[PDB]
RNA sequence: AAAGGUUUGGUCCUGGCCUUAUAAUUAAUUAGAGGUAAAAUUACACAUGCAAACCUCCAUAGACCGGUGUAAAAUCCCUUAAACAUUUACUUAAAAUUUAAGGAGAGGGUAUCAAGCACAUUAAAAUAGCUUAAGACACCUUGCCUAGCCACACCCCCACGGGACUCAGCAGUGAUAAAUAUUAAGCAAUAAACGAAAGUUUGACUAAGUUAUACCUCUUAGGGUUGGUAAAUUUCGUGCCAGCCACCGCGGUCAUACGAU
RNA sequence: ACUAUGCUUAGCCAUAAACCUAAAUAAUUAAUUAACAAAACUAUUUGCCAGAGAACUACUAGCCAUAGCUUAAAACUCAAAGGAC
């Protein structure tokens, strides 16, 4: 049995379910939540369930969490321009908090798709090379082309050993 | 007005020391994923920050701005803001003084003092 | 950490001095306390020599000017 | 689009601030009533104790 | 449970105590010499520090304390 | 251990693999120094043929000579290999029959 | 791991060791040809030959290719600036290739290495600080990041200087080691250097030589094993001896366990 | 028979089968018998363990401790040791 409560939170599939990819402006997200109370239950669940998913998709964003410092829970984002975006998450479900932050400071699906395509621009199927980078190492693998001499012996007339013998014979 | 090279253009941390002149030692923490356990833990870093007015006290949360030119070997940030003062917090949501999870001044009232 | 204003009055009235917890624990034993005393003394001597050298160097320059 | 989203956020914070003042107002009325009753019990007990 | 594992430790400790009893005087001379070497290593380590710092004589009014001798 | 304790310690520390009589090498060449007999610890009974050798590394080891009958003598050269003789305690090397001075057992 | 064998008079539990799978090197025995890949004891000392030229004088090149894994926890990934011993363009901009200062995060061992001893800040030159059990410092070990990268180039970390005075370029030799490729041909191909060019040069490379180390196609058959784990023994000899076993174990006269068959 | 000693006044030493062999805290008593013991079992946090012997040992550092305490290996040996029945 995996240790801890809700061990599914410690699986790569769960971490990849996060959908909030912050814009490049977002630099820090401080989370102020209270460990005791009734109006801060959603914030506590947001720290428990959602903060891992947010960090997984935003490795360069500093998430620092403070406990029992204020009467109510809130989220404050620090942007590169110097703006500070305060969010009030009291009486809000953990799912509601995720949707709110996605709207205001989350990249759109169109933007994310474009980046994925650009990343793969330099991979070409026709390119030959090692398996890590290319589909086929050599043209011998292609159908109809002369096969590799190791797998299939070449005709004698196509061999330097044979050609050199003829030149001596000439 | 080119910006710093350092990755940490904006860092939040706690002032863990203030015994250097016009400098505040700040401990920042980030979340790092343990690859074996797939759980996040806290990796903490120390940042020297220029406290021009010596307005920082141990235990207060602060925001640092990366300096364009390193002031010294270790001082590469300045104190942008004091997010939370130690024991003197002001609620961001309501704006009233607080002492923990309680209001020193009720939000219903309008003291304007 | 919660009410700094109340904290300041209580310490002044009750006459209680509050020292903040030291970040790092320092071990103590005869060998360490003796080496740590010399190291502090050696530094001070080196710095005292530098101050004397700076004064002599500046004094010579002033005479030349 | 950033400016519009930052305007919507401030409105949401004001909308929730309004609810907080409405909720906390109700508490002041009820808690005030309880405080008066509790002070009455103290007055009765305090006189008896004297 | 039986006391068999305790009996092994019982014999090990008894035999060790009699071995220490036999060679008690030899052990004393070993210790006084191990402490003397422990002091010289302490003194030398202090000389290394000031010599590296650039001092040619130990700091004024300094005498390495003798911390391993019978001072108490 | 808790997840915090597993994180602070990480994977189990692994004692290093100390080498054996051959020093992690397939074979060694040695010069015979003496030929003697060793008695197999009880409950076995035999007069096992062994020899001391100075290996190329420079150390000296005791090597069991397998087979029925050997012609080894002092100053001979042999190729030793690994493999302990279970009954003979301390004998962690064996001689290879058919290499250098040592020869194959004469078949009967 | 789909597991198995082995604690005991016996059972259960716990627990180590070992077996079964895969691959490299060396060794024993054995071996036809053909194709292909790889070639590897040693930063110990090196006989001999060769490995850098081109070219109307100036220049350019010999800073590459090739070799080794010396040193070093050495690094990876990323940011910023700058040049270039460059190219191609313009009289001003696109690249390739480097250098310097850095840091979100990641990065070997020993904590019986627990303290380091100046490792800080301010900028009237004062303050007493800086790193460290969230592992500093010390010591030890190792090339890693693998379309490749990093370091090294006889030794003294460097190379003014000094010394024990140069194959870690190809081939080859001595010594050393369990470890064994030709002191070979060609510049025709591709790559590099030079030239305006026809061209020239190249132990890079290409085509061969050597070798069951691997793979492929074939044709001869040899090696080991046969108590259990674990597929498979007849007769005889031996008699706790001679010998055998990876583990448990076998051998004291009807031994499926040793030797021959 | 008799002493050190048990007692008192100060200081030192810092060890026990110091074991109720069961860390502390908050639960739960059904969805729940390896054996034995004092029923099972979840969460939180720290400490500790990784075959037996060698070893309450060697070396190191600290300590009023000097035949001492805490800290604590390796070589080497074995194919088991151990717990309950
Ligand atoms: S690998 Fe393509 S010809 Fe051999
Ligand atoms: K026997
Ligand atoms: K087992
Ligand atoms: K060098
Ligand atoms: K050519
Ligand atoms: K056969
Ligand atoms: K007890
Ligand atoms: Mg009993
Ligand atoms: Mg004993
Ligand atoms: Mg038993
Ligand atoms: Mg061979
Ligand atoms: Mg190269
Ligand atoms: Mg090395
Ligand atoms: Mg030690
Ligand atoms: Mg040489
Ligand atoms: Mg050099
Ligand atoms: Mg050579
Ligand atoms: Mg050379
Ligand atoms: Mg070879
Ligand atoms: Mg040209
Ligand atoms: Mg028989
Ligand atoms: Mg067998
Ligand atoms: Mg047989
Ligand atoms: Mg008496
Ligand atoms: Mg007494
Ligand atoms: Mg104890
Ligand atoms: Mg008791
Ligand atoms: Mg004891
Ligand atoms: Mg002891
Ligand atoms: Mg000791």
Coordinates of N, CA, C and O (backbone and C1' of nucleotides) and ligand atoms in Angstrom, one line a residue, chain G residues 25-29 178-180 211-213, ligand 11:
Chain G
rU25 P 34.1 -9.9 -25.7 O5' 35.3 -10.1 -24.6 C5' 36.2 -9.0 -24.3 C4' 37.0 -9.3 -23.0 C3' 37.8 -10.6 -23.0 O3' 39.1 -10.4 -23.6 C1' 36.5 -10.4 -21.0
rU26 P 39.7 -11.6 -24.6 O5' 40.3 -12.6 -23.6 C5' 41.4 -12.2 -22.8 C4' 41.5 -13.1 -21.6 C3' 41.7 -14.6 -21.9 O3' 43.0 -15.0 -22.2 C1' 40.1 -14.4 -20.2
rA27 P 43.3 -16.2 -23.3 O5' 43.0 -17.5 -22.4 C5' 43.8 -17.8 -21.3 C4' 43.2 -18.9 -20.5 C3' 43.0 -20.2 -21.2 O3' 44.1 -21.0 -21.4 C1' 41.1 -19.6 -19.9
rA28 P 44.2 -22.0 -22.6 O5' 43.3 -23.3 -22.2 C5' 43.7 -24.1 -21.1 C4' 42.7 -25.2 -20.9 C3' 42.3 -26.0 -22.1 O3' 43.2 -27.0 -22.4 C1' 40.4 -25.3 -21.0
rU29 P 43.8 -27.2 -23.9 O5' 42.6 -28.1 -24.6 C5' 42.3 -29.4 -24.2 C4' 40.9 -29.7 -24.6 C3' 40.6 -29.7 -26.1 O3' 41.1 -30.8 -26.8 C1' 38.9 -28.6 -25.0
rA178 P 49.2 -12.3 -15.1 O5' 48.2 -12.8 -16.2 C5' 48.2 -14.2 -16.6 C4' 47.0 -14.4 -17.5 C3' 46.8 -13.6 -18.7 O3' 47.5 -14.0 -19.8 C1' 44.8 -13.6 -17.5
rA179 P 48.4 -13.0 -20.7 O5' 47.2 -12.3 -21.6 C5' 46.3 -13.1 -22.4 C4' 45.2 -12.3 -22.9 C3' 45.5 -11.3 -23.9 O3' 44.3 -11.1 -24.8 C1' 44.6 -10.2 -22.0
rU180 P 44.4 -11.5 -26.3 O5' 45.8 -11.0 -26.8 C5' 46.0 -9.6 -27.2 C4' 47.1 -9.4 -28.2 C3' 46.8 -10.0 -29.6 O3' 47.4 -9.2 -30.6 C1' 48.7 -11.1 -28.7
rU211 P 43.9 -15.3 -39.1 O5' 43.1 -15.0 -37.8 C5' 43.7 -15.1 -36.5 C4' 42.8 -14.6 -35.4 C3' 41.4 -15.2 -35.5 O3' 41.3 -16.5 -35.0 C1' 41.3 -12.9 -35.1
rA212 P 40.4 -17.6 -35.8 O5' 38.9 -17.4 -35.2 C5' 38.7 -17.5 -33.8 C4' 37.3 -17.0 -33.5 C3' 36.8 -17.1 -32.1 O3' 37.3 -16.0 -31.3 C1' 35.1 -17.9 -33.5
rU213 P 37.2 -16.0 -29.7 O5' 35.8 -15.4 -29.4 C5' 35.5 -14.8 -28.1 C4' 34.7 -13.5 -28.3 C3' 33.5 -13.7 -29.2 O3' 32.4 -14.3 -28.6 C1' 34.6 -11.7 -29.8
Ligands
LIG11 MG1 41.5 -16.2 -26.3

